[PDB]
Write a structure and sequence with these properties.
2 copies of one chain form a homodimer.
Chain A (H helix, E strand, L loop, with lengths): L6 E8 L9 E9 L5 E4 L3 E2 L4 H4 L4 H9 L2 H7 L4 H12 L10 E3 L2 H11 L1 H6 L4 E3 H11 L3 H4 L8 H18 L4
Parallel strand pairs in A: 1-5, 5-6
Antiparallel strand pairs in A: 1-2, 2-3, 2-4
PDB class: hydrolase,translation
Keywords: nuclease, hydrolase
Assembly: dimeric
Chain lengths: 180, 180
């Protein structure tokens, strides 16, 4: 059921913070309805990247991605940027029409930078706006720090759980920070 | 007086949407206190770019920036990326310490992309987070559309006027879309 009011949540992992030097190594997406009810969980895909690219990762990235097991999944992966892009679009097309949903998540500005460069078609599937939960978090700690005590993220490596946590964060802000 | 709670608002103009192919042609900044009171407005600088660079602009861009007179300002400008970056930094350093303020404005995710590539020192001066007012506009439209009618923007070619309206918009949401 593709509804124009549905929201696309995304979360990527990368070899580094530089779009021109680094690459996407993992992608995960999920769709909620306008009211944040999770409707469908898309595929979590380790994006294959060469051994030379992986050798370029800085100290902290190599540690985090090797420790989570992502490095192994990336090497065993048979899906590069385009293949992972296509599967993600195939999933999204069934839940949200193109150009309708802003990109949703926490600090998704950095993620969109990589989409622009390596997954242009998926990037264009989003509405141009950004729906960054961290923006509300920033405003909450500046104008109502109280609410930040009532919600605490556990932290995880699993891409999807990370996203569900972003959805929960925004749902918290909707009830106790936003004035509906 | 630099205060760790002050917010840095910024608005750029570019020759196009592609950071690797386009360039910054205008930059304007403003600083507000934690409560959105404008403390100081920085310099509005047309950033010089070569005639060739300007020839790589698309139809929509060349038309918009030519009519506004920005193209003439660019050609005459004696301040390239670095020098415009230095001037912006001298201004900001007097009102906000480094790494404290997220980047603020409307859809500034796109602006930050250009700062990462052409003004990295300025980019690093911001806290890594984004304070995109358009994120609140998007939520208001989906959860409490009634308040939308009560706010309107004139539309202008003056960068500072755009930033002041962004500030006002956020102030509007703080009053009609946020709980004290």
């Amino acid at each position: 059921s593709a509804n124009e009011n549905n929201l696309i949540w995304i979360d990527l992992e990368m070899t580094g913070l530089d779009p021109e030097r680094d690459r996407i190594i993992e992608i995960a997406t999920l769709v909620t309805d306008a009211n944040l009810n999770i409707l469908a969980e898309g595929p979590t895909i380790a994006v294959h990247q060469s051994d030379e690219q992986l050798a370029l990762m800085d100290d902290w990235n190599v540690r985090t991605h090797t420790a989570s097991g992502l490095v192994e999944r990336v090497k065993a992966s048979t899906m590069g940027d385009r293949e992972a892009e296509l599967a993600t679009l195939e999933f999204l097309k069934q839940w949200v029409p193109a150009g309708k949903s802003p990109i949703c998540g926490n600090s998704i500005g950095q993620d969109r930078r990589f989409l622009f460069k390596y997954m242009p078609e998926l990037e264009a599937y989003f509405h141009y706006r950004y729906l960054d939960v961290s923006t509300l978090k920033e405003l909450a700690r500046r104008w109502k720090p109280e609410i930040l005590d009532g919600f605490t993220k556990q932290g995880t490596h699993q891409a999807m759980d990370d996203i569900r946590e972003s959805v929960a964060e925004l749902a918290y802000y909707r009830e106790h920070f936003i004035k509906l």
